Amino acid sequence: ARDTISRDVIILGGGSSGTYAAIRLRDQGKTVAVVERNNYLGGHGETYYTEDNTPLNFGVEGFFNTTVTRNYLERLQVPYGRRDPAPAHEDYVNLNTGQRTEYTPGQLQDREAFAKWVDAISQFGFLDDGVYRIPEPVPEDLISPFADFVKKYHLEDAVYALFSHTSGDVLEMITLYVIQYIGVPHAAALNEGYVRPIEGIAALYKSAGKELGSDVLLETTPEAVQRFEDGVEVIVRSADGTKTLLKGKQLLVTIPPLLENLHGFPLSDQESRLFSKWQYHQYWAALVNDTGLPDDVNIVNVDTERLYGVPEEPFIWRLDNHWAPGYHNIKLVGGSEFGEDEAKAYMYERLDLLHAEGTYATHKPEIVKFASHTPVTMFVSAEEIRGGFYRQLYELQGLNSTFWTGATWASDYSTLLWGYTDEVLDQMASS
Ligand SMILES: *Cc1cc2c(cc1C)nc1c(=O)[nH]c(=O)nc-1n2C[C@H](O)[C@H](O)[C@H](O)COP(=O)(O)OP(=O)(O)OC[C@H]1O[C@@H](n2cnc3c(N)ncnc32)[C@H](O)[C@@H]1O
Numbered sequence: 001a002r003d004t005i006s007r008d009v010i011i012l013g014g015g016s017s018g019t020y021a022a023i024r025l026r027d028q029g030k031t032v033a034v035v036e037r038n039n040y041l042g043g044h045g046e047t048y049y050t051e052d053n054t055p056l057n058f059g060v061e062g063f064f065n066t067t068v069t070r071n072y073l074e075r076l077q078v079p080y081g082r083r084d085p086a087p088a089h090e091d092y093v094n095l096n097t098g099q100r101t102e103y104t105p106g107q108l109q110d111r112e113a114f115a116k117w118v119d120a121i122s123q124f125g126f127l128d129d130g131v132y133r134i135p136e137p138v139p140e141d142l143i144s145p146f147a148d149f150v151k152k153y154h155l156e157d158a159v160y161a162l163f164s165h166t167s168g169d170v171l172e173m174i175t176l177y178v179i180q181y182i183g184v185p186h187a188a189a190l191n192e193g194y195v196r197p198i199e200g201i202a203a204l205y206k207s208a209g210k211e212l213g214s215d216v217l218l219e220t221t222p223e224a225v226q227r228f229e230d231g232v233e234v235i236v237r238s239a240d241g242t243k244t245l246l247k248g249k250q251l252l253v254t255i256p257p258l259l260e261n262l263h264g265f266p267l268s269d270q271e272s273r274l275f276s277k278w279q280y281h282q283y284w285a286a287l288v289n290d291t292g293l294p295d296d297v298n299i300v301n302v303d304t305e306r307l308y309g310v311p312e313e314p315f316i317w318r319l320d321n322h323w324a325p326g327y328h329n330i331k332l333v334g335g336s337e338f339g340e341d342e343a344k345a346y347m348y349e350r351l352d353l354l355h356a357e358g359t360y361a362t363h364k365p366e367i368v369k370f371a372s373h374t375p376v377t378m379f380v381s382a383e384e385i386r387g388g389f390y391r392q393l394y395e396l397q398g399l400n401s402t403f404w405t406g407a408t409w410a411s412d413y414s415t416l417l418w419g420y421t422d423e424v425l426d427q428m429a430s431s
Pocket residue numbers: 012013014015016017018035036037038041042043044045058059060061062063064220221222254255256261283284285331373405406407408412413414415417
């Protein structure tokens with residue numbers, strides 16, 4: 001084995017929440033090691049740089065312009081500003097049929113849709129910061145099907161706009177999870193405009209990586225964990241085959257807590273029971289070029305044969321252009337079995353259909369990146385929520401020196417995850 005590394009906190013996953021935690025902990029005077037599966041920091045925060053250093057973000061697009069965000073970007077010395085995407089006209093296209101259409105009749109634009117939606121969900125103020133702190137008994141409207149909620153709250157004209165900001169088929173989701181994609185802070189942020197680093201989302205992670213240096217272990221994963229009342233041990237494995245023992249006073253886990261993800265990780269009966277309940281979706285973030293598409297179009301997917309224009313999974317959620325000519329992002333969402341080969345084939349088939357129908361002169365594109373964002377939408381049934389799933393989930397925090405954060409534990413937006421992570425760090429700093 002390599003020389004044992006002892007730190008105050010071992011952090012599993014150097015994505016958005018793990019990197020934030022690392023920087024915040026260091027500033028608190030706690031030492032860290034970050035264990036990261038990939039060969040880069042940032043997880044869903046991904047940038048491809050062209051020859052002339054144009055940043056092509058193909059995961060995260062931006063952050064909410066709040067104190068938490070500004071403090072962090074400023075902390076890391078990262079120049080930032082309002083997101084200003086390349087010029088584009090919107091073409092409404094039914095990607096399920098390959099045929100051009102228009103915005104669904106009766107559907108509102110974002111600002112007007114958000115106003116009606118925010119009024120309807122204001123009653124769930126406990127979700128204002130994206131944390132699943134739900135009173136029990138659970139308000140039944142919160143765990144009703146979104147499709148039912150929009151009828152009851154007279155929001156039928158707002159649905160497409162909400163879908164457009166939710167990476168999933170909203171008509172098959174309960175209301176809670178739609179709120180956790182396009183709720184109160186989310187709507188405010190979109191109305192104002194996101195902020196992001198000038199030199200790409202990856203610039204944040206490059207800066208953090210420079211600070212953290214050898215305390216980041218890239219292409220490294222936990223192999224065997226021991227969790228004690230006062231400390232942890234994590235045996236990690238690196239791509240070069242070396243193993244390292246990490247000793248921590250505490251452990252912070254940003255890995256999605258699917259049971260299959262927690263091999264080597266001892267779990268209590270309660271942890272095992274709760275984590276057995278997860279359901280999820282797959283999410284693929286592609287950057288393509290040589291597509292035959294117009295440089296100046298964003299293609300907006302409207303299902304003309306479905307209620308409110310919302311497509312059924314699997315679907316292309318986004319198909320938008322870039323400042324660098326020829327490059328497009330394609331984001332695809334499906335069920336838990338919508339894996340890499342299925343998603344690539346689906347993408348190619350949708351693009352081919354546009355040609356077959358005479359809509360665009362597409363040809364098979366070049367894939368620059370095809371990134372897994374699976375799992376997305378870690379969720380449980382309405383019945384589990386009614387039985388206090390999220391209360392029980394949060395009660396897990398702190399067992400045997402172990403703490404958790406990330407997209408499973410709070411609304412899956414970097415700004416909100418940073419806020420929740422700070423709450424977890426506060427718990428970790430209890431005296
Ligand atoms: C998928 C996605 C997400 C996204 C987005 C667009 C796409 C396509 N647009 C966003 C946006 O514009 N604004 C925003 O704030 N968020 C947006 N998101 C959501 C995104 O998930 C969050 O911003 C955030 O990235 C989630 O943070 P979290 O820390 O929970 O997750 P992560 O970034 O994926 O990082 C997890 C890290 O853990 C590593 N990992 C996984 N398994 C292991 C193991 N076994 N060992 C070690 N490391 C592991 C991952 O590699 C990753 O780095």
